[PDB]
A paper describes a structure:
15-PGDH represents the key enzyme in the inactivation of a number of active prostaglandins, leukotrienes and hydroxyeicosatetraenoic acids (HETEs) (e.g., by catalyzing oxidation of PGE2 to 15-keto-prostaglandin E2, (15k-PGE)).
The protein shows the α/β folding pattern that is highly conserved among the short-chain dehydrogenases/reductases (SDR), where a central β-sheet consisting of 8 strands is flanked on either side by two arrays of α-helices (Rossmann fold). In the crystallized construct the last ten amino acids from the 15-PGDH sequence are missing, leaving Tyr256 as the last native amino acid. Instead, the cloning procedure resulted in the fusion of nine non-natural amino acids (Gly-Ser-Lys-Glu-Asn-Leu-Tyr-Phe-Gln) to the C-terminus remaining after cleavage of the tag. In the structure of the dimer the artificial C-terminus of one protomer is folded over the top of the opposing protomer (highlighted in orange in Figure 5), with a number of residues engaging in interactions with side chains of the other protomer, notably between Phe264 and Tyr217. The acidic residue Asp36 forms hydrogen bonds to the 2′- and 3′-hydroxyl groups of the adenine ribose moiety, while Asp64 forms a hydrogen bond to the amino group of the adenine moiety. The nicotinamide moiety of NAD+ is positioned close to the catalytic tetrad (Asn107, Ser138, Tyr151 and Lys155), competent for the hydride transfer from the S-side of C4 to the substrate following the reaction mechanism conserved among all SDRs.
Author numbering:
A (entry chain A), B (entry chain A): 0 to 265
Write the structure that this text describes.
């Protein structure tokens, strides 16, 4: 197994919710963490609050809209300049908005790809890095349909195909970078609350009760549980292209795509 | 079964390759077809050539970049103004380009969503339409990884999640619109040739032989075979949210997601 202690992590959407859980779990495991978020106030407050549990030198906050490509490039550069290295990238920022759905794709999918590629720019052995791990936040919505969130579902499916593909490319390139995704069920955060608002649901707002019924039936995961999954991916050297599911029913487990790579051609 | 004769189809990327096969198959079945493409010359030549087999009044050509949202809206309006109705939308335009990958997402995914939503704007029973069918071109790359085409793979996975989701939403809304996707193996067109060019493959150009080897092993489908799949979807009233695969091994067949909708939560 890989030891987390002393590694440098860049976590997007780290100011709150699952991102903040990731930052906390990483810090407890001895990592240094660059918290990256577009929410300036929540980001600064998050770092300030973390000073009480962790030495201030363990964290850095950088304000960044992940969908602004020059902003995101500048952010990676500042992180590497500050900590001297990059070992773990977590592309976690995401939103739910079926009304302004183009922006949802830009944040949820386009920015996961752009951040992944910047991670490879720094970490690939062939680019002068020493390898590392990139973890992309998908959802169960990356594997099954969501009638009330078709664009969110598209963005999450996008992450699964991209991640499995980039993981194979990394093997071919001998970049030493492992790429995995996490697909949680419902988690207790601000994204879950957005299903109540026409601002976020648009034409789908009338059907929101179907989601609420699901949440009542299956229950809600605590963000730390998702962080346990992240740590698992980081520590297990054999996981590349893994699609990790996390649910109330089965806890941490994996999508099984079988042992026949070209199944669908056969 | 639904009869194709007399229905009005809008086919994007209709100037060549699979889109043109779709237009030809639809015309033979008695449909009227709006051929939509950004390639002005190939589009005009395509309509001109089709006059030899079909009455000129069966076709309309409209130049349109599907990624330009105002252009695409204007295009739907011109189609409905011309033919008086819209029954079949085929979001088929797509590209392969891992270098300019943001544009690939805009064309392959964003424009499929934008066109789908415009199809629903016209065809939904709740918007004053009478229902219809929307067919989105995915690929086997929508269901399995492609090491040399991770963004193309992301775009195609996006279409599968979006399509299955929008199909469920249509049921909830009683829009009378069926939404399905087609996932072919390799097909003999200009997209297949693009794997040879660094312009289109970027960082993945060195690994192109792995794709070529696959093509040699599994063989190549003729575009008319894909058009047979399209006609099947249009004529079979029971197909909604179907993910149709078309391969040299099995011909036309379907991805089976099983009879347990919430499997992944259980
Ligand atoms: N909460 C759930 O039920 C659930 C389930 C599955 C997957 N997810 C995924 O988990 C990830 C984190 O979401 P969350 O539930 O913690 O939601 P959240 O709203 O609580 O946290 C998201 C964070 O991302 C930040 N962010 C959003 N857009 C950004 C941008 N453009 N640039 C920089 N920062 C941005 C926000 O400011 C916020 O701090 C998302 O990708 C989400 O899709 C959540
Ligand atoms: N050829 C294959 O092996 C294969 C396999 C699976 C899926 N597909 C999918 O089939 C669909 C059609 O591709 P094809 O193989 O016939 O390729 P093609 O290059 O031969 O035809 C694509 C057509 O789309 C048009 N187009 C591209 N971008 C456009 C835009 N922005 N606006 C308007 N028109 C645009 C082109 O001008 C062209 O006429 C694509 O979505 C492709 O991803 C192809």
């Amino acid at each position: 197994a890989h030891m987390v202690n002393g590694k440098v992590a860049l976590v997007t959407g780290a100011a709150q919710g699952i991102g903040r859980a990731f930052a906390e779990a990483l810090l407890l495991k001895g990592a240094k963490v660059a918290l990256v978020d577009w929410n300036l106030e929540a980001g600064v407050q998050c770092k300030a609050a973390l000073h009480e549990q962790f030495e201030p030198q363990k964290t850095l906050f950088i304000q960044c809209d992940v969908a602004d490509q020059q902003q995101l490039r500048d952010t990676f550069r500042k992180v590497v300049d500050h900590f001297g290295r990059l070992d773990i990238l977590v592309n976690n920022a995401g939103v739910n908005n079926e009304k302004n759905w183009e922006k949802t794709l830009q944040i949820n999918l386009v920015s996961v790809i752009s951040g992944t590629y910047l991670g490879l720019d720094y970490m690939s052995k062939q680019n002068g890095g020493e390898g590392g791990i990139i973890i992309n936040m998908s959802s169960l919505a990356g594997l099954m349909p969501v009638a009330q969130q078709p664009v969110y579902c598209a963005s999450k499916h996008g992450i699964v195909g991209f991640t499995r593909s980039a993981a194979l490319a990394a093997n071919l390139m001998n970049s030493g970078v492992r790429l995995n995704a996490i697909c949680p069920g419902f988690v207790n955060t601000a994204i879950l609350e957005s299903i109540e608002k026409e601002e976020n649901m648009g034409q789908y707002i009338e059907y929101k009760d179907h989601i609420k019924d699901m949440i009542k039936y299956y229950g809600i995961l605590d963000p730390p549980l998702i962080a346990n999954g992240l740590i698992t991916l980081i520590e297990d050297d054999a996981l590349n292209g893994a699609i990790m599911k996390i649910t109330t029913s089965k806890g941490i487990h994996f999508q099984d795509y079988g042992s026949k790579e070209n199944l669908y051609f056969q």
